Amino acid sequence: EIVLTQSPGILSLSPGETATLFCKASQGGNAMTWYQKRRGQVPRLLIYDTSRRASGVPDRFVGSGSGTDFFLTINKLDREDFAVYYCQQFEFFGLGSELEVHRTVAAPSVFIFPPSDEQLKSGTASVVCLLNNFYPREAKVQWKVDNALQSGNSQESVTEQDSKDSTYSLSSTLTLSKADYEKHKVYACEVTHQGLSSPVTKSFNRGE
């Protein structure tokens, strides 16, 4: 069994430059084939027998490689040439290589949405941390219940990079039983970024 490896995972790179993607075979073989997936758009064949073009592939995709290391390069990186790429030998696949939009750092405006009585009348309430308008996509967003760390009761989702601002959001939840929220008082989250020199928390004490 051949195992295919790809690097980097995310390549943050600005338009007008070059971008060089890597796939590594484990057995010294012959050829490789590359596909293009545009954010959910029925994946298309890109490079073919390691250096030939498929039908309708522009000249900006130049295939290259030999032995166990194989390359892809886009010479003038456009805005539509941001996608996720895959390499294939006979029936074995890689894991992916994602192209994103580069931008300077920013700071998300932290919120804390209080647990309403609207959901606690059903028995499970929602304490919703909520970050908006930031980049990079990675963040370490923690939370605390009566100043004590919890786990296993959260479902956190990120979003995608916008076409107008090129930023990100994040929304975590802390779903507990109705005995558990009125038991405690001090509710707060925690926000931590590369672009923040200090940890930021906000609070909502229950009953107060």
Binding site: E1, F90, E91, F92
Partner: protein, 147 residues
Amino acid sequence: QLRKHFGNNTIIRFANSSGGDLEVTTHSFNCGGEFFYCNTSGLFNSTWISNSNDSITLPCRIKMIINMWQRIGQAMYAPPIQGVIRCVSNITGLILTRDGGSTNSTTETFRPGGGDMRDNWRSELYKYKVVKIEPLGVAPTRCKRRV
């Protein structure tokens, strides 16, 4: 000599088939004027683990309206043969195929394969090539037409 292509310490197994028509799940003949389709699930069934007179019987079907190469709207018919039929033949070769999904096991499995006639002919005319004979040639020397 499969193990020189895959590895010494591997396990080699034979399975039988996985579906299709009678032309590719079974063994087809053309002997004596009739068309036999024998069930070969008794030959391709064993494992191999890297360490007299009893014959294997194969049941066999007969049909007389065949469509060879599956052309649209065409079919043949073989007239019946008067008397019982007898045949003797040699088996010189197989056409296997390999399954190969992406798992980590050390157990290969090889199955017999059927329907493409170019494997019957490519297994016989393999040692040949046709060449062209170009008679004219030029070479430098010291000859001088003598004016």
